[PDB]
């Protein structure tokens, strides 16, 4: 038997997520003591972020950034800091940094 149509239901919550409050914050800490914000119970438009003219890297793992906007997460933690630009090579899973 073939399906008639798709039926998509996330929860009723239209509360927009604070991604534009993290990605615009005045002072990301020293990478020594990074600021984490715990995102929950809100709508996450990551296609505000994926489309951006700013980002030098948008590397992603276990999720594609084009699939990311039609998905849902149990929480999201935005771990924020500053580094010398070369050190991006050590900001990757399994790299011996």
């Amino acid at each position: 038997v073939q399906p008639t149509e798709s039926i998509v239901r996330f929860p009723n919550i239209t509360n927009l997520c604070p991604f534009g409050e993290v990605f615009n914050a005045t002072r990301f800490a020293s990478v020594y003591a990074w600021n984490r914000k715990r995102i929950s119970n809100c709508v996450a438009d990551y296609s505000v972020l994926y489309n951006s003219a700013s980002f030098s890297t948008f590397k992603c793992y276990g999720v594609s950034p084009t699939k990311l906007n039609d998905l849902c997460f149990t929480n999201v933690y935005a771990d924020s800091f500053v580094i010398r630009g070369d050190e991006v090579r050590q900001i990757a899973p399994g790299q011996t940094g």
Binding site: G62, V63, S64, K67, D70, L71
Partner: peptide, 17 residues
């Protein structure tokens, strides 16, 4: 593999991955 729910792999990853 990352998760045995095959529809989760398909919905989360692009075809080369």
């Amino acid at each position: 593999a990352i998760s045995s729910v095959l529809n989760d792999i398909l919905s989360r990853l692009d075809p080369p991955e």
